[PDB]
Symmetry: C3
């Protein structure tokens, strides 16, 4: 349909779409109030992802940013997505572990700064400044990952085995997947064009589908979502 | 003052404005913590509506979108309004019925997607794509209306008669009024210019004032807002 | 680095930055769940402030708005900041006083309208309309300050002496500092160029650092954050 990345944008749209329908069907009939929350948070994530990928496929989520002299194609839609989508995931983890409201707020705020800053960076005209924002964004992410890995884990150890083990898997998955985004951003169209928009869109696609559908699958198929 | 719809924008500004002052006065002195919530949610709704209509009257909430060849006047302010305003209404219904947090979250998310998608649609350059977004938006709305009509009603039947009956009226009103927006959008300046911006603004005005002031009146005048 | 206000933007960036690090260090090791909330809300405030000042220093948070004929430099970043930052402060006050959810919602909404309206005003092309938005914004602020001064105080009197006294100081500080913003706006680049962007940025800088770091200091150093 034009841009060479369109295909990956198309597959992501479809996969996020199918992931949503699958979770909607699976959560059908669930009466446990605690399970309801998990199904609602986890299903909304890909749902949002669906709408944003579609805006990128249709060309809407793409804008033009000048820097480095030449012209640059920046998909701003990703930030619109991640803005609500990363915190929701954090909410799933927090509920699983029964995190204190104080830490949930700190984590959501750090997330908002992470994405807000990432977005600013992506739209900054002075090529050199874009990295400053990257550094601030990455620092916010490391703060989140630090709390998830050391703070939540400890909270998870006070739960029953099924809950503790599922949190462990989800924790490992988010830490690994999340840390890949700033790398992809840095070596891609947003930072250094070392990697073509072509290959980047493919990476974000695998990362996103894994972080949402995959994450959703691991969580929604375990009995950890039931308070018992 | 220029555009032929200005008058309806003016009456809406005034009515939303008067509706706010009226509710502010009526909620004065209320000490019941549960009633306070209802008064706060219900009063903020028209208050937000006030500010957005004014931006449309003054020309600020109007932008220009190219599609179908010719030029199109799109009031984006409505989405800014509805973005916070539709969920608040959902919150009133949820409190009345004491809905589970899981469903409140799902409903607020579906609402966010509904408006976010509606906005995208309204600002899309490819005339044909605008309808795709309409379809997604309408699907989100039908999901909300489905849960309100069948899920909330059942929750409402566990409450005392005054609460159950008031929820019934509000439920009927929102289902009917809400379903009219996508129709108006489709046959109006946002979709097919079958209906002139002139008549459309009049429709949204009646719909909005009914959905907020009317809804506010029905709710704020019943003892259903008191937990007893 | 160009614009004459750059220096104040630089000092604000640094002070907000140092204020965040200081609070992050101070809140380290705190286990009280109630203290955690206060530290999270109070630390995020300057953190957000940091990111926005930096966007203004680097030129990103500055835009051009035509009105009064001549050209006008408007830093929109301040609203992006205040949008999340003013409510957080309100949340600190509400927790301290254990305010009803209804009033917290009303206050957050009034705040959202205050900033949203202030932003609209700042970006309006018709010089005369900018003041209409100012008036609406100021009315929302007075509503907040009224509730904080008379409503919260009363709520504060049911708490122990340390809490009541700390709320008193914070209450006095916010009322005074908050009321200065609409004055600065009115006599500055946003309204009447009586005061040069040079002196204005200096004022907002002192006001902001006082409202956040100062406020943070007064609150985070008292035992009022401990539910005991
Ligand atoms: C309502 C919604 C739910 C609120 C969501 C939160 C919101 C605050 C933030 C999302 C954050 C952030 C990522 C967005 C900000 C980034 C910013 C830089 C981009 C803004 O653009 C997005 C705007 C579109 O603007 C368009 O309209 C205006 C006015 O009419 C135009 O002035 C502007 O130019 C338009 O831009 C579009 O077109 C551009 C095209 O550029 C060129 O234009 C010329 C014509 O002039 C030619 O057509 C060129 O063609 S050619 O010659 O080159 O061939 C053409 O290139 C593009 O470049 C632009 O990219 C753009 O397409 O819209 C706002 C989007 C909304 C807010 C997204 C909704 C997202 C989703 C549904 C949200 C669900 C959220 C829900 C609330 C979660 C609930 C969670 C619960 C708690 C659980
Ligand atoms: C802070 C606030 C509380 C946050 C609210 C949430 C926010 C994320 C989203 C609202 C969602 C969504 C609907 C908005 C996105 C849609 C997007 C496409 C529109 C963006 O425009 C809105 C911007 C204005 O941009 C303007 O400034 C920039 C920078 O200076 C310009 O680049 C831009 O062009 C400007 O656009 C205005 O002017 C345009 C004029 O076009 C032409 O311009 C030329 C000059 O170049 C000539 O003047 C032309 O004249 S002529 O020749 O034709 O004769 C002229 O036509 C217009 O076309 C544009 O439409 C526009 O007027 O501002 C952002 C608005 C804010 C966010 C709205 C605040 C709303 C309300 C107060 C919110 C209350 C919320 C509260 C938080 C709820 C709490 C609830 C509790 C939980 C209970
Ligand atoms: C994701 C984030 C967390 C969501 C935050 C909430 C969000 C809904 C609202 C913030 C509210 C409000 C204040 C913003 C709306 C105001 C609006 C008018 C301004 C919009 O601009 C901001 C956009 C940038 O747009 C830029 O990109 C588009 C698309 O590519 C361009 O079309 C647009 O023009 C760009 O504008 C920038 O550049 C302009 C430059 O103008 C001229 O441009 C030419 C080239 O064309 C030349 O370069 C000129 O140079 S020269 O010749 O004159 O020499 C040049 O002047 C500037 O004028 C513009 O000002 C702008 O720089 O981005 C959106 C910003 C994001 C959303 C901010 C993130 C803020 C922070 C990190 C948020 C933390 C929030 C967290 C969620 C809190 C959690 C709290 C818990 C509950 C506790
Ligand atoms: C479903 C989407 C997910 C889980 C997205 C996660 C995204 C991130 C962890 C993004 C992080 C970034 C930085 C740390 C700095 C560079 C800019 C970003 C936004 C790519
Ligand atoms: C006070 C305002 C109210 C109750 C607004 C309700 C608005 C809707 C239910 C809008 C729905 C739409 C669709 C279903 C698709 C077409 C686009 C919209 C946003 C008009
Ligand atoms: C950390 C930042 C703080 C405490 C900011 C407070 C800002 C205000 C109270 C702003 C108020 C305004 C009006 C009342 C109308 C004029 C426009 C504003 C946004 C400057
Ligand atoms: C475009 C529409 C997007 C809709 C996103 C909604 C996510 C809904 S999850 C769903 O929420 C119900 C509460 O309504 C629970 O009862 C179910 O068990 C649970 O699975
Ligand atoms: C521009 C200003 C917009 C303000 C919107 C605020 C809606 C306030 S409702 C009001 O909230 C109080 C708590 O403060 C309760 O005590 C009252 O009973 C109730 O009626
Ligand atoms: C760019 C990163 C911005 C991060 C902002 C986070 C504010 C964190 S406050 C911190 O939150 C912890 C919970 O994680 C509590 O345990 C600590 O006692 C408290 O002091």
């Amino acid at each position: 349909t034009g841009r060479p990345e369109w295909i990956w944008l198309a597959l992501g749209t479809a996969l996020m779409g199918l992931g949503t329908l699958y979770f909607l069907v699976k959560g059908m009939g669930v009466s446990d109030p605690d399970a309801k929350k998990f199904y609602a948070i986890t299903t909304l994530v890909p749902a949002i992802a669906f709408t944003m990928y579609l805006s990128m496929l249709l060309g809407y989520g793409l804008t033009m940013v000048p820097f480095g002299g030449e012209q640059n194609p920046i998909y701003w839609a990703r930030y619109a997505d991640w803005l609500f989508t990363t915190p929701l995931a954090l909410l799933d983890l927090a509920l699983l572990v029964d995190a204190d409201q104080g830490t949930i707020l700190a984590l959501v705020g750090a997330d908002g700064i992470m994405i807000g800053t990432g977005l600013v960076g992506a739209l900054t005209k002075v090529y050199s400044y874009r990295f400053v924002w990257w550094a601030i964004s990455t620092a916010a992410m490391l703060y989140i990952l630090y709390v998830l890995f050391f703070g939540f884990t400890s909270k998870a150890e006070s739960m029953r085995p099924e809950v503790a083990s599922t949190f462990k898997v989800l924790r490992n998955v988010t830490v690994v997947l999340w840390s890949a985004y700033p790398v992809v951003w840095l070596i891609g169209s947003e930072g250094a064009g070392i990697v073509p928009l072509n290959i980047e869109t493919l990476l974000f696609m695998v990362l996103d589908v894994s972080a949402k559908v995959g994450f959703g699958l691991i969580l929604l198929r375990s009995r950890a979502i039931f308070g018992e």
